[PDB]
Amino acid sequence: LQRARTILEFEKMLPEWLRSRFRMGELCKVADEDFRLCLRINEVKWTEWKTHVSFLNEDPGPIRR
Amino acid sequence: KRLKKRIFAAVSEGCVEELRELLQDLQDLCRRRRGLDVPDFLMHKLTASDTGKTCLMKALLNINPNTKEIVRILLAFAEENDILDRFINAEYTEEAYEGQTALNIAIERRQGDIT
């Protein structure tokens, strides 16, 4: 919490144009018009062995190219 | 008439009627050019120009509670023009996750029955 207490204050005393792009930006949603909302990528492990209905892509690890 | 985009749609949903109309159409177009590329041109109409992905690879991407009939008629089309061995044992050739036949997906999709 205390290092979290610090880190925002540095950003608060950073009025630049925010070059530190901390995120995947404007990565498209499933909604056909809503291709907005910057996102995140994370990793999960072995549980709940099943078929997966919902997906977004043709399963690469990073983005293509 | 971008039939590839039509049939990649048509397996993504999984309408067997729409698939069959695509199946009747492309076979009818195949009979018009009965020259030398009767295994080759039909394969290229199934082959993705980027990724090497066939319809069958696209098929095993989206699971569907109709897909057993879908693959069955699809393979019946593959046996119809004698392309099945070239078709089934075709692999991912876009050198990212390469060498992946769709058979890989079938175990990964936990569908051992149709596998």
Curated annotation (Swiss-Prot), chain B:
It is found in: Cell membrane; Cytoplasm; Lysosome. Non-selective calcium permeant cation channel. It is activated by innocuous (warm) temperatures and shows an increased response at noxious temperatures greater than 39 degrees Celsius. Activation exhibits an outward rectification. The channel pore can dilate to provide permeability to larger cations. May associate with TRPV1 and may modulate its activity. Is a negative regulator of hair growth and cycling: TRPV3-coupled signaling suppresses keratinocyte proliferation in hair follicles and induces apoptosis and premature hair follicle regression (catagen). ANK repeats lie at residues 1-32, 54-82, 98-115. It comes from the Eukaryota. This is Transient receptor potential cation channel subfamily V member 3. The gene is Trpv3. Expressed in keratinocytes and hair follicles. It comes from Mus musculus. Homotetramer. May convert from a homotetramer to a homopentamer to allow pore dilation. Interacts with TRPV1; may form a heteromeric channel with TRPV1. Interacts with SNX11; this interaction promotes TRPV3 trafficking from the cell membrane to lysosome for degradation. Belongs to the transient receptor (TC 1.A.4) family. TrpV subfamily. TRPV3 sub-subfamily. The chain holds residues 117 to 231 of 791 of the full protein.
